């Protein structure tokens, strides 16, 4: 339905064929369908009419919670405790947030997977760089941290990366 | 090994000297004192038990006596306790403030221009 963003889990337009029948003999498929929509979906879709009458008398919210920007690790002197510690919770906050993002292409995966049947190999590859791109970014971000993980530490590897990568690139040039 | 017996203008026997007077004296809820009069209340609990008497009722008056010396004499110790760890501090201070050549401050770097090493674990 409408509850959940449709560009964040997106799906094809769900192209489904017409039945063709070509024989008299009745379709047993389609009078259990009958029978189950009648003896079935009927009251329960009045039993959900009536609890969402009950819950249209008392309606309430409840919001997102925003989060300022607050200076990163790479802005803290060397032993400022208190500009530390809320780079530290940003940081660890950042992590979840990117967490939930590979949750994310990795849920599109999934389900383009089973929605293609037989053609996913070919149907799929979109997907599948999505998600081998988000992961070499998200390997690059956090792996090998270990355990006691730290802002610190992710600034020491993305250093370290940018170093090699800096060598790599001015030996390149002299090339 | 001996630090602060031999500071300047320490008169010998005293327990208090006058310049304690300017530090706040502790309340007399202090956690500490609390905990010295549960030293006297044990004190006198033991006091019953050895003596063969009912632990909790027998001396009433011996009991409030104990808590009562206990409290009494622990006041007396934390003030003694805070005025030698201000003296501490004070000199502390003076001795930074007087060799500022030996505490010198240097600028401090912020982590994106510090390069520290990285260890992966794996
Ligand atoms: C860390 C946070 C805080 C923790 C607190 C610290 C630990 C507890 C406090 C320690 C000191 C307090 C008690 C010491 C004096 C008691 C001596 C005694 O023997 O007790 C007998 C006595 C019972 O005897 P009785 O009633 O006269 O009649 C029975 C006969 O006497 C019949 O008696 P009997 O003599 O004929 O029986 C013979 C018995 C006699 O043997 C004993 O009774 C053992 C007594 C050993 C004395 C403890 C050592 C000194 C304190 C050091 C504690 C170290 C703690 C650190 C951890 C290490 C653990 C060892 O011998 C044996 O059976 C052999 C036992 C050998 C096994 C080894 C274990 C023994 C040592 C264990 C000590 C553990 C700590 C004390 C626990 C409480 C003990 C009462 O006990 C009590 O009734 C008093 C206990 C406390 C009651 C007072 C509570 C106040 C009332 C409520 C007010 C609320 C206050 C807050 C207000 C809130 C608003 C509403
Ligand atoms: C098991 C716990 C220890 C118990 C210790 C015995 C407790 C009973 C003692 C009775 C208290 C009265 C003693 C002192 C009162 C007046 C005398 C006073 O003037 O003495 C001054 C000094 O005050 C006393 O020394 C302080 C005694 C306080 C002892 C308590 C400390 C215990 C350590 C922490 C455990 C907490 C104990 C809890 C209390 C029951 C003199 O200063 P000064 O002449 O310049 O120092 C001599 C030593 N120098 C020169 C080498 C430095």
């Known amino acids: 339905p409408d509850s959940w963003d449709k560009d964040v889990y997106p799906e094809p337009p769900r192209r489904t064929p017409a039945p063709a029948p070509q024989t008299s003999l009745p379709n047993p498929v389609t009078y259990l369908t009958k029978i189950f929509d009648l003896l079935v979906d009927r009251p329960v879709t009045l039993a959900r009419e009536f609890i969402e009458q009950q819950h249209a008398k008392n309606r309430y919210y409840y919001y997102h919670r925003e989060f300022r920007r607050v200076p990163d690790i790479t802005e803290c002197e060397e032993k400022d405790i208190l500009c530390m510690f809320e780079a530290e919770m940003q940081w660890r906050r950042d992590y979840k947030v990117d967490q939930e993002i590979v949750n994310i292409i990795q849920e599109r995966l999934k389900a383009c997977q089973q929605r293609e049947g037989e053609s996913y190999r070919q149907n799929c590859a979109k997907e599948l760089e999505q998600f081998t791109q988000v992961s070499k970014a998200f390997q690059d971000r956090y792996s090998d941290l270990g355990a006691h993980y730290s802002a610190r530490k992710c600034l020491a590897k993305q250093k370290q990366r940018m170093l090699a990568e800096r060598k790599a690139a001015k030996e390149a040039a002299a090339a | ?122």
Do not use: W
């Open chain 2, 1 to 122: 090994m001996t630090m602060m017996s031999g500071r300047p203008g320490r008169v010998p026997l005293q327990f208090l000297p006058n310049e304690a007077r300017s530090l706040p004296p502790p309340k007399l809820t202090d956690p500490r004192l609390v905990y010295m009069g549960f030293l006297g209340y044990c004190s006198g609990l033991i006091d019953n038990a050895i003596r063969r008497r009912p632990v909790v009722s027998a001396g009433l008056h011996r009991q409030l006596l104990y808590v009562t010396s206990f409290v009494f004499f622990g006041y007396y110790l934390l003030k003694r306790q805070d005025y030698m760890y201000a003296l501490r501090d004070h000199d502390m201070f003076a001795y930074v403030k007087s060799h500022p050549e030996d505490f010198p401050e240097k600028d401090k770097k912020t982590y994106g221009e510090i390069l520290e090493e990285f260890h992966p674990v794996r």
